[PDB]
Amino acid sequence: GVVEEAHNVKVIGSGEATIVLGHGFGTDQSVWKHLVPHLVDDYRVVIYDNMGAGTTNPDYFDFDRYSNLEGYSFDLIAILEDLKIESCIFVGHCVSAMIGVLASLNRPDLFSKIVMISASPRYVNDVDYQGGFEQEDLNQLFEAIRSNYKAWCLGFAPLAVGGDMDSIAVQEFSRTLFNMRPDIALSVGQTIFQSDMRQILPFVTVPCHILQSVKDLAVPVVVSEYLHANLGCESVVEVIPSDGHLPQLSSPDSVIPVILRHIRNDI
């Protein structure tokens, strides 16, 4: 259907046990390339692109629908319902972790657990919360995207991915990032980095596994503690000894075993 097609949905395997992987800002379903090989023998595996990703049709990017994360939640639910999935493990990277959280509030029956990679409910600091960014930092970032998107992608990609400047992962992310239409990238950046999910966390009832790199430009480690402290569900934290915001792409060897352990085991 149009929905699946518009989100580049892929379904590999079959049977009841199902895993759905949602990607973060500036990347796409390719971010799961090191993970999917190890799921397909035991799970039906679904991957999809977020509306707004460079791989999707700019014409379908409804600025109003996606001016908050509920837009994306609805799409996730829509895909789940189209594929007739009654229950899944959701793996959400970055914004997808919060998209899955929202969606689970609407439809907790759809999700047996959530595994969050590099998740944050709030990036902006206040006097009683460390999110890793002052508003002035964000304003600076948004201005760099407006001003010169290419330059911004090339500067941003190394910092986000971490590790070596000219690794394969940096180059890959630099590419997917610049694949987004500039105005879409700016709009989505604002939607995500200005988001606040902190207040709904107590309402979550689906179990969450909170994984992040010990070093992540966007996600200080205290954020994982905050999520763990304020989620109403059962949760567990594992900070990985890895660098970067897309560690499943850039540090597969240290990261993928950890993800798998959280997918394969309950709390």
UniProtKB/Swiss-Prot annotation:
Phenotypic consequence of gene deletion: Increased seed dormancy. Long hypocotyl phenotype under red, far-red, and blue light.
Pfam families per record: Abhydrolase_6
Effect of residue 133 to A: Fivefold decreased affinity for karrikin
SUPFAM superfamilies per UniProt: alpha/beta-Hydrolases (SSF53474)
Tissue specificity statement from the Swiss-Prot or TrEMBL entry: In young seedlings, expressed in hypocotyls and roots. In adult plants, expressed in rosette leaves, stigma, sepals and silique peduncles and tips.
Disulfide bonds: none
Name recorded for this polypeptide: Probable esterase KAI2
Record gene name: KAI2
